Amino acid sequence: QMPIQRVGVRAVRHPLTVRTQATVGTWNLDVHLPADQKGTHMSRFVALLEERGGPLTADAFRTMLATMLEKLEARAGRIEVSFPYFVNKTAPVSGVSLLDYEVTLTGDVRDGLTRVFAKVLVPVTSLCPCSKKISQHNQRSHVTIDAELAADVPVEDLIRIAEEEASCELWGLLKRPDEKFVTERAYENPKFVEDLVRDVARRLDDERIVAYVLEAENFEHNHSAYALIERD
Amino acid sequence: MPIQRVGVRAVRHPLTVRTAEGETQATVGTWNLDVHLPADQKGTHMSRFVALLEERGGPLTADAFRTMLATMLEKLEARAGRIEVSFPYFVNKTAPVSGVRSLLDYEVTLTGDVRDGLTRVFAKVLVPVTSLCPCSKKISQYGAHNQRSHVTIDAELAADVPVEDLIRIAEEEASCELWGLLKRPDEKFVTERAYENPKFVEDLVRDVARRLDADERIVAYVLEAENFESIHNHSAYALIERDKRR
Amino acid sequence: QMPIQRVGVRAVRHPLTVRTAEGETQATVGTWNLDVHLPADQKGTHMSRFVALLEERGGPLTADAFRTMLATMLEKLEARAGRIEVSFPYFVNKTAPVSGVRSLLDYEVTLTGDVRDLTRVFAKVLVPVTSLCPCSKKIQYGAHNQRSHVTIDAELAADVPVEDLIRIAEEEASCELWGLLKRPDEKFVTERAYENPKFVEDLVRDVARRLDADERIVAYVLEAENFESIHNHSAYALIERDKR
Amino acid sequence: MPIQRVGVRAVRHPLTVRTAEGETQATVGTWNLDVHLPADQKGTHMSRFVALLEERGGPLTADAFRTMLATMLEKLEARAGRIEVSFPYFVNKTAPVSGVRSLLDYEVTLTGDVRDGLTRVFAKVLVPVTSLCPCSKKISQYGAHQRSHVTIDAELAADVPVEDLIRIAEEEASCELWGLLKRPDEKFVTERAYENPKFVEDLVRDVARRLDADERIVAYVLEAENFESIHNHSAYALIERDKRR
Ligand SMILES: *C[C@@H]1C(=O)O[C@@H]2[C@@H]1CCC(=C)[C@@H]1CCC(=C)[C@H]21
Ligand SMILES: *C[C@@H]1C(=O)O[C@@H]2[C@H]1CCC(=C)[C@@H]1CCC(=C)[C@@H]21
Ligand SMILES: *C[C@H]1C(=O)O[C@H]2[C@@H]1CCC(=C)[C@@H]1CCC(=C)[C@H]21
Ligand SMILES: O=S([O-])[O-]
Ligand SMILES: [Mn+2]
Secondary structure (H helix, E strand, C coil): CCCEEEEEEECEEEEEEECCEEEEEEEEEEEEECCCCCCCCHHHHHHHHHHCCCCECHHHHHHHHHHHHHHCCCCCEEEEEEEEEEEECCCCCCCCCEEEEEEEEEEEEECCEEEEEEEEEEEEECECCHHHHCCCCCCEEEEEEEEEECCCCCHHHHHHHHHCCCCECCCCCCCHHHHHHHHHHHHHCCECHHHHHHHHHHHHCCCCEEEEEEEEEECCCCCEEEEEEECC | CCEEEEEEECEEEEEEEECCCCCEEEEEEEEEEEEEECCCCCCCCHHHHHHHHHHCCCEECHHHHHHHHHHHHHHCCCCCEEEEEEEEEEEEEECCCCCCEEEEEEEEEEEEEECCCCEEEEEEEEEEEEEECHHHHCCCCCCCCEEEEEEEEEEEECCCCCHHHHHHHHHHCCCEECCCCCCHHHHHHHHHHHHHCCCCHHHHHHHHHHHHHCCCCEEEEEEEEEECCCCCCCEEEEEEEEECCC | CCCEEEEEEECEEEEEEEECCCCCEEEEEEEEEEEEEECCCCCCCCCHHHHHHHHCCCCCECHHHHHHHHHHHHHHCCCCCEEEEEEEEEEEEEECCCCCCEEEEEEEEEEEEEECCCEEEEEEEEEEEEEECCCCCCCCCCCCEEEEEEEEEEEECCCCCCHHHHHHHHHHCCECCCCCCCCCHHHHHHHHHHHCCECHHHHHHHHHHHHHHHCCEEEEEEEEEECCCCCCCEEEEEEEECCC | CCEEEEEEECEEEEEEEECCCCCEEEEEEEEEEEEEECCCCCCCCHHHHHHHHHCCCCCECHHHHHHHHHHHHHHHCCCEEEEEEEEEEEEEEECCCCCCEEEEEEEEEEEEEEECCEEEEEEEEEEEEECECCCHHHHCCCCCCCEEEEEEEEEECCCCCHHHHHHHHHHCCCECCCCCCCHHHHHHHHHHHHHCCECHHHHHHHHHHHHHHCCCEEEEEEEEECCCCCCCCEEEEEEEEECCC
């Protein structure tokens, strides 16, 4: 006798192309059920994915959210997708490699507002500031940028914002000469997890992003160091 | 640029937990201790977090969790922060026909936050239950489709609530409860009662939410239910949220 | 001064394109584990080679192409022994039983290739299926059923499309799995499960039977897990036959 | 057809473990109990498997592990079977210089197998350690490039405490791990790990020497993953050795 804000499918694995790049994405498609209805065409959620096509595009994602709301005869819902994203970048001096970043594109239709969010987990390098000054500790960190979008924003732009405010970016292949630069860059710029977040937010604190949730996790100890800063 | 959450993550440490009855259960809790850093400050004492779990000695009780939050806040010289411990819980149960005593696993998460001098204490429990699809017993001459289900109950608490009391609500409001040890009688009463009580992922959350609304000890809750479909590799999901003050 | 059996990279995730049994192409993302062997004398390996080899490659991975990659590494890494492993999600167009509506199903496919003094090639298939206990029906109107995982690791003597192992498993379970199933189709899947109930042992035995008959599988290890719906524990059954 | 392993999987049931000193430790383990099914009999009694865990008393010692193993063989009426449990283990360590203490998390998988009258018993430990680069340090003017996991699955010839298996990995690495660390303790770990850089290739060989010596261990499978901090992949190394050969 009460409304179920999210009713739907979860963990739907089905291929997906983005732009071009073919990946595989896991879907979480859901709709809101009113207080008087009792069921939903969960089969339609599958039929959508299995029939939809085209490179996913800001516009194709917005249309896919709309088609769902009709196919399911609904007024609110969300389309969530988690897929691997790669980027062919160049070495700092070598000229050479592809890196894996996990992206999450989410779009909800509530109160006549189709809000498009996007998140990317980026591998980045960090170096302790206390050590070095304390002594005569360069682990890897995971930066998560969940950005509420006011206008279209590429994921590689967000990836660039994170790798550009860190002791060092990550490269799959790094010739031995490059290793020096990457290793010596941290020695110069000791980055405290407490600071990397502050610095990263400043780049988003950007108008294509009205709101965001940015988290930095360092893999020190067998524990971890985590900082999150939300906004509006 | 203030930092809303700054602390440690993924600290594992043994833990003692006290039940509704005079039973204390020893578990392993992975802790995530965090605080708030304003713009005036520019760094926190990470080591202090790790010290409070080692320093403390006792059975995590509803009052011991409160003191911990404050303790942490003072030991770091802050006025806001959060504490989350994820531990595995267990309850001895009597099988439906046998009465055989078997232990069932439960995933409990104790969280507590302080913001603006207000301490919201929340409790999430992952409850394993059985689901039987309603349009399978009426669409088919013989049989029905059954899967395992995950019922998650995150609840802001206005009062102490036993985690077993949250398990008792959901297990009662489902097609059939889970038991580790069952024999031929046990597995007969189980199968038949579930066919007799078929429910949707849509129905499950509603039945539970109503029992939740009869508990004034829970001011707010976020209910969730996943059905690991037997006929599909995908799962089904339903979610309900409620701030009773609105 | 000790032979390090296999040293190399692990968890290298890289995009891959694989030709199917139909000749068609399947683009998936696979995580790679490329390693080499260090004799008692050699003390170090140029780890960077593995990474390069992956990105500087080209061509849809094939039975012949995969064997070639193992050979190329052995030269790029100055080695006589190495192992290359790729684990990737794979999909097939499964058509519904009664409505004929087609839909894709997920299958984790792991491909292992080893070249140690004889190049042994393997294939792993994870078949999700429905299980039904044969002792819930006889104990009236009612059965306990759930999802199951059939794992088939097979050493290849000739080319064997994974699709040839899925069918067997899907056919040897009480019911196969479908993503898009309409009301007419959700009744044949709920009935045949009652009709063809099967224990975890009754299942594994039925599957391994055609594996030793496939004759292109030199060896195999078959697993099956029932994610029981009446317990929080999973039923298991593993059978290992070499026949060599 | 005969099936080698048939049984339960992923049963969570609290357990108590014996520490070297003799003290006890409470943990929660995931038990995987399985048997060998002959072509003669179609049905195992799976239930019993859960009954054997609930009907248990006291700490998992070396004799209690073999007792359980056997007791389950008689309750299930079989001639072969395996029992595996994986539990978190903790050790009250001492910070290098300040003496502040901290518990460290270790993953211990205890395997036991009766087959053909011979009861084999194995022990696996994952030890969280630090590694540094015997290539980045010198080649670079300043700075060093991560945490690693060392896994030692050892076939035991006699009763061996897991802490002794933990000691070999923590000592033959660059540095060990600590939960709580002071300022004087964080300066010794940064230099002494840098002063003693060891490769993944160098890490595994150094441990095996000690393993090859301990006559308590007849066979072992040694693994090492360095979880690279400059890269999105990890380094792997494996050693295999049944001295009886
Ligand atoms: C240690 C040496 C280095 O400078 O960084 C490393 C390399 C060996 C091992 C490893 C962690 C990486 C693989 C390629 C490489 C350049 C990285
Ligand atoms: C009973 C009905 C059915 O047969 O199909 C199932 C089930 C409803 C819930 C759910 C587990 C399934 C998702 C899609 C599907 C068709 C549903
Ligand atoms: C036939 C099953 C039943 O009714 O309950 C049992 C039988 C075996 C299959 C099933 C998945 C489980 C595991 C163990 C158990 C007692 C349960
Ligand atoms: O490095 S700090 O967490 O002691
Ligand atoms: Mn530090």
